[PDB]
Design a protein around this ligand. Structure first.
Ligand code: UTP
Ligand code: MG
Lengths: 357, 139, 49, 139, 157
RNA sequence: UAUGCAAAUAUAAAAUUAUAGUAAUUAUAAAUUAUAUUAUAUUAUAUUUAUUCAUAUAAUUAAUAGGAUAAUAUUUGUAGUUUUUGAUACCAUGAUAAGGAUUAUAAAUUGAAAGUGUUAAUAUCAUAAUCAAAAUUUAUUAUUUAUAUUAAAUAUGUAUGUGUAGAUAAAAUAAGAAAUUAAAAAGGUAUUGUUGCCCACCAAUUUUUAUAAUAAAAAUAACGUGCAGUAAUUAAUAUAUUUAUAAAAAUAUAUUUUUUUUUUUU
């Protein structure tokens, strides 16, 4: 007894009462429990995977002879998780001076993909001339029939997303299902980079197209980073695409939408310095994201806030109200009778009591 | 409820306590100097013989027994040690020729009886010592 | 008889034998175990309909 | 009757016996006990090689201490500098306005008398004054 | 604060948390303080490498560092007051108003044993219980047997 | 301390009180309640030891948040001020202790339930809390006595005075102790039950008989003086005398609704 509670595991009186097992009775397991086998939860970690690559991979794989031959040139190009800091113009010049020499389309494509990756890492926007020089004539032009390698197209997309180039649509439309059909092979990192770049560029239709394609191709919305989604959804202003975003926001999980709201709030508030480019003010999208998170999250109970202004019925609180209207009930009954037809329709009713106010 | 401040120490007590403490410290300085002087003088001054002349080893006449050994072998160092009980016992241990006879059979006068001066001839001397000297019972 | 302990038996140890049970008791009858709103004063606080 | 916050919270429980050297509230009433031969080995660090306690030094970027700690050992600079030295004691504080060279190397708690012999005649009540007179402490 | 909407029935229960925090600070500082104290007052030479001035200067510097260590847990364990975690009643270890195994005061122990809140067995009040070591030598014998079981049992490497 | 002056309980009766008008019945009974062993007999009690007893300090109690060898969330770095009010420096219901006097030898334990600071409903300025180095005046506490005396957390400088007044503490259990001892009766007027009923006086209001400077009687929860009665503190009852702040008290005589103690010609 008292304010301090009694722990039943330590208290022997509870453990030896008639509602538990007495020590004289045999001690043995009763009703063995299997919780982890009947329904096993997937491993969802609050902390992000520390050993994750956290970047776009280019799947660099060429013939060993060509690789060792180009090794002096390839030392400057990025390796696996190793990024040399050579100037981008040096590797661009090396490629534009040595590509005609080596006779292998696949090797040239892989080398150009590595060049694009390096210049994207350095955020050097001058490399699109390489694409126009080499790939544009045969891979995408007036109905080009060639099939570009996945490594090259992924590298080009990464470069255009990093440089916020406006030429990404001409390649993405080819990468839809009716063309090259390289959408299912795009990594979630690639999708996040695309979404962040389009959100920064402020394209209204690009975000809608990318989100619809991701849903169609089963991209992992949960593993897509929250900041990229927030930036992509900040740029929508048109009513139609806004309605599309409203109806599409239900695809994300509850935890995902909660952390989307958290990231949006912190970024447009205190975390405005986290982004290199400040985010534009979109109060409509901010409010809708907050409202959607509130809808999806479980609703708690706050009775005082809910019923602060609650007032009881006139008849219920007549005894406790000194100045309350009681003839209103008779007026309502008269109106109900007139509607029913028992009383004459639209009969003149005079006030039954004085007005005390 | 509504607590109020209540004085605890006298209004003028603090300064009086301070000056009393200062005067007590000065008096303690004087007494410390006096006690150091008295302790050094007591340590240097010769004390009475710390051995009982009524027990088996120290019973022979002064012309025989251990007294001959004391007078002809270790007499010189007794004056230098001023007949204090600890040095005389240590010298008796180190001189040999007695073995364990200084502890297994010999006895010595009590701690407050062995600290009397060279010539006392009275039992009540230990209570005649100065009392204001804080030498911890060392005359 | 009075109880001397309490165990969480999975309820299929002591079932009603089939021949004294309504037919299959699942599709024909829908049973919901709710709680009385009146003062129980002793009895089944959670009763099924 | 000592007046403190812990007086109400805790209880004396009579003249209860505590483990040796483990009384809860230490009150070194014997710090000022004088002993000339044991001057350097009473209420002081046992080894002469030990450094002075941390309380004798300033560690951080201080702004000022109202009084120094009792364990701080008096040094020559305390008297030579002619600065202000204070030690917290009942009732309020004791200030070293009489710098002397005879207290160098001794702790300030040893120098200061904890149980002051002076008795305040002001805050004493009628019954308490009668009790003190009966005990002989007051005329 | 200031007894506005207090949740715990007793304000003094927070002193238990404060005592736990001071114990954690002791856990942090028990090695550094001990090492500094050992180095500072070691008169003998440490080794061939450090002797004479190279040792005395090092001792002075490490003592200066120890003094500069702000917030070091100097206080010993026996001078830290023990306060019950159930009713915030103070008891001093070594007396009968504190039990070592349960870390609760005499009053709390009596209340818990008189009710059902702690599985204990009753023995004679004027005996040595049922333990063989207590019957053999008593408190000191069982204390030494605990030491023997802990440390002296092992042939240390 | 009977000679005179003096009808008087041994009962022909109609609810209490009152002059035969005052108030609304009045009395009484039973049960129970702490005062009285008796002398062989359910136990011999009777010896040893001890007594200069003291300690408390420097203020903030009202959230959850997971990391290597896991198929991928920057959730790296999780960001919405402000409408409540008691265990706090009183008070703020309950609950554990100490306190040996009659169920005993026997295959056995010499510690109790009648309650001890902290604990679970009464609120309405309450920041009183150790993390060292600290301030006897307060009932409830076995200290070392005369050969050798201060080294590690800092640890007691005071009181030698014919084993010495009064007062007082402990033990009949692995220790050593042995003939006079427990074992009757005996009471409520109280029911709110002795911290009780009740008594007059004092004090205050008022009623009835009365008109005569009258007298008498009756009702009333708190005052004042007391303690008269209630086995009730030198018993009570009746009549007579006497004293007077008041209940009453003391005497003379007669009674016990006073509770009681054994002698059939020594
Ligand atoms: O999920 C996160 C968290 C933080 N950041 C931080 O953003 C900083 C740059 O700010 P931005 O992230 O706005 O720039 P960006 O679009 O050029 O970034 P990338 O796609 O190239 O990464 C970077 O230095 C990084 O630490 C992210 O880029 N992403
Ligand atoms: Mg009477």
């Amino acid at each position: 007894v008292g304010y301090t509670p009694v722990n039943p595991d330590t208290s022997p009186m509870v453990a030896y009462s008639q509602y538990h097992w007495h020590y004289n009775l045999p001690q043995g397991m009763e009703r063995p429990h299997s919780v982890n086998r009947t329904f096993a939860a997937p491993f969802q970690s609050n902390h992000s995977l520390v050993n994750k690559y956290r970047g776009v991979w280019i799947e660099f794989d060429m013939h060993p002879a060509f690789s060792v031959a180009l090794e002096p040139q390839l030392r400057k190009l990025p390796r696996g998780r190793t990024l040399p800091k050579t100037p981008a113009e040096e590797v661009i010049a090396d490629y534009t001076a040595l590509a005609p020499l080596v006779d292998d389309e696949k090797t040239r494509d892989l080398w150009l993909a590595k060049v694009f990756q390096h210049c994207a890492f350095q955020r050097c926007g001058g490399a699109m001339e390489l694409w126009e020089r080499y790939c544009h004539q045969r891979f995408t032009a007036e109905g080009a029939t060639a099939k570009p390698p996945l490594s090259l197209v992924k590298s080009v997309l990464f470069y255009c997303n990093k440089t916020d180039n406006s030429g990404w649509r001409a390649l993405f439309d080819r990468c839809l299902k009716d063309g090259w059909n390289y959408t299912p092979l795009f990594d979630t990192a690639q999708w996040s980079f695309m979404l962040k770049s389009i959100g920064r560029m402020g394209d209204e239709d690009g975000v809608r197209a990318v989100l619809e394609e991701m849903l169609d191709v089963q991209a992992d919305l949960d593993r897509v980073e929250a900041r990229s989604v927030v930036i992509a959804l900040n740029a929508v202003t048109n009513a139609d695409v806004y309605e599309f975003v409203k109806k599409y926001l239900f695809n994300f999980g509850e935890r995902k939408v909660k952390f989307l709201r958290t990231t949006y709030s912190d970024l447009r508030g205190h975390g405005a310095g986290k982004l290199r480019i400040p985010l534009k003010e979109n109060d409509n999208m901010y409010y809708h994201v907050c409202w959607h998170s509130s809808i999806r999250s479980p609703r708690q109970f706050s009775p005082r806030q809910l019923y602060f202004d609650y007032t009881p019925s006139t008849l219920g609180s007549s005894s406790h109200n000194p100045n309350a209207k009681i003839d209103d009930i008779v007026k309502d009954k008269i109106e109900k009778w007139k509607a029913e037809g028992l009383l004459p329709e639209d009969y003149v009713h005079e006030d039954r009591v004085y007005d005390r106010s | 409820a509504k607590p109020k401040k209540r004085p605890k120490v006298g209004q003028g007590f603090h300064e009086k306590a301070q000056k009393w403490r200062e005067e007590y410290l000065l008096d303690r300085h004087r007494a410390l100097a006096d006690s150091l002087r008295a302790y050094v003088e007591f340590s240097t001054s010769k004390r009475v013989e710390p051995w009982d002349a009524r027990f088996k080893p120290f019973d022979r006449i002064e012309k025989d027994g251990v007294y001959v050994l004391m007078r002809y072998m270790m007499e010189e160092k007794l004056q230098l040690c001023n007949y204090h009980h600890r040095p005389v016992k240590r010298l008796f241990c180190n001189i040999g020729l007695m073995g364990p006879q200084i502890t297994t059979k010999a006895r010595w006068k009590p701690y407050r009886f062995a600290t009397n001066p060279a010539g006392t001839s009275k039992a009540e001397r230990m209570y005649q010592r100065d009392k204001t000297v804080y030498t911890h019972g060392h005359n | 008889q009075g109880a001397v302990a309490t165990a969480e038996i999975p309820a299929f140890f002591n079932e009603r034998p089939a021949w004294e049970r309504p037919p299959l008791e699942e599709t024909l009858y829908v049973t919901t175990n709710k709680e009385r709103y009146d003062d129980v004063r002793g009895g089944d606080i959670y009763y099924d309909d | 009757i000592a007046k403190s916050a812990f007086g109400f919270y805790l209880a004396r429980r009579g003249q209860r016996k505590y483990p040796f050297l483990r009384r809860p509230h230490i009150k070194n009433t014997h710090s000022m006990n004088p002993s000339a031969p044991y001057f350097w080995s009473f209420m002081t660090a046992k080894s002469q090689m030990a450094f002075l306690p941390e309380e004798n030094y300033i560690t951080g970027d201080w702004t000022g201490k109202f009084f120094v700690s009792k364990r701080q050992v008096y040094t020559l600079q305390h008297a030579t500098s002619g600065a202000k030295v204070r030690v917290k004691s009942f009732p309020s504080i004791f200030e070293f306005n009489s710098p002397s060279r005879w207290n160098i190397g001794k702790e300030m708690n040893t120098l200061t008398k904890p149980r002051m012999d002076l008795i305040d005649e002001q805050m004493l009540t009628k019954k308490q004054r009668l009790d003190y007179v009966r005990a002989g402490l007051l005329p | 604060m200031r007894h506005i909407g207090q949740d715990v029935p007793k304000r003094h229960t927070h002193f238990v948390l404060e005592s736990r925090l001071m114990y954690e600070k002791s856990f942090r500082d028990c090695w550094l303080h001990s090492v500094c104290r050992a180095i500072s007052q070691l008169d003998e030479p440490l080794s061939k490498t450090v002797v004479g001035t190279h040792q005395k200067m090092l001792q002075r510097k490490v003592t200066c560092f120890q003094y500069n260590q702000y917030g070091l847990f100097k206080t010993p364990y026996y001078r830290l007051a023990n306060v019950d975690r159930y009713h915030a009643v103070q008891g001093v270890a070594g007396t009968r108003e504190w039990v070592p195994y349960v870390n609760v005061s005499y009053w709390t122990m009596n209340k818990m044993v008189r009710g059902g809140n702690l599985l204990v067995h009753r023995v004679h009040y004027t005996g040595w219980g049922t333990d063989s070591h207590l019957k053999k030598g008593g408190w000191e014998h069982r204390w030494n047997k605990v030491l023997q079981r802990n440390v002296l049992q092992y042939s240390r490497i």
